[PDB]
Design a protein around this ligand. Sequence first.
Ligand SMILES: [Zn+2]
Length: 424
Amino acid sequence: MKLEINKFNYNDPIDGINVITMRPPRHSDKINKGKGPFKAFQVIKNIWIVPERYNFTNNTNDLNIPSEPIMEADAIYNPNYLNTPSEKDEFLQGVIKVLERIKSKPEGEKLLELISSSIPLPLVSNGALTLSDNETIAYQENDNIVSTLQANLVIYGPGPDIANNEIYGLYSTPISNGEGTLSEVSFSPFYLKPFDESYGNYRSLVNIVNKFVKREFAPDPASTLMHELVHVTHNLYGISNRNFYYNFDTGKIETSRQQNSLIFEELLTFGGIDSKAISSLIIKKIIETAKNNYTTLISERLNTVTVENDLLKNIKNKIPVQGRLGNFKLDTAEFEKKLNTILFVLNESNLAQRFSILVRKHYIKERPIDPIYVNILDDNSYSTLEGFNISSQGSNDFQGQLLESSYFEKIESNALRAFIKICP
Ligand SMILES: [Zn+2]
């Protein structure tokens, strides 16, 4: 069946199929007592949109201006953002439009198909693969669980910083042992953080001899979400380990941050020039670790399955295996090929090239730039087929991402980074 993106209005009635009231996956943590349930929409099979602020972890529990100086220089705080039905519907339309943009090119459609079908490896109960809260969300009505529905990804609005984007895996052992875990993404399609890039096609003073200089650009929020979707793929395949750092001075992996380092998960997910010189030693160690984790799961868990059900069919489509029930073995050549695609081909820089989207040269930015607001629901500013770089308006070749473009609106903030207003 061709991949379907479900459209919705925030006021669509509950149906128990694609529209539910969802109990938070992290409902058991004491910081989440009494939160929810929240209206949720199944935009793609096993992919849910929840138009609510992300505040289900220790670092996101308080949406107010922080009580410590921990705040980041380009953060914008507003505890009231996304508390009205109109802002929730705008958020829902924005996430749906960004997903339609991602599905508009074959590389984006295949990424969405991969997240939709790549369920975490379930536990075995009475010889059958059986679902847990690591692979599902609960439809709660009053104080009763009506049903559990499969979920590989739940997309929420932003945490405390309304211009920040983050990903959280639900269970820390499955995220790195080859099983995989449900992911929650906090995403902001309307509040963007600009970046610097050298460019020469902009209005310049006549006395400037060389106009090729660093200029400010806004990111395409589809590139921002695709970045998080690559992290999601790593989380679903259980190959994410955030404890490793890449040291740019030595070219070595380390288990702690050093002077000139970057979390290795971010180095791979962003890609670009910084991932082109990774040593064969690092690449072989990553592949051998994943292969050993998968060999162990096939031997200790998949070979204990005695019940052929739809979940087993789904897992055989996710994990390349050979053999028959009770005697499966990893298909090494096909496993290596899929793993290298998910780790080294799938990244924000490679996907941005396919969509003609400008991204920065390095994951780490040299300086903070104040966030802007942009109404991406306006087709005159942002289209699903071309994003901000609309050819019929002469904005091809990344010019529509130039920050002086009229649709990027300034946000006035106070010294504490508190949101004051959008300047139209
Ligand atoms: Zn990232």
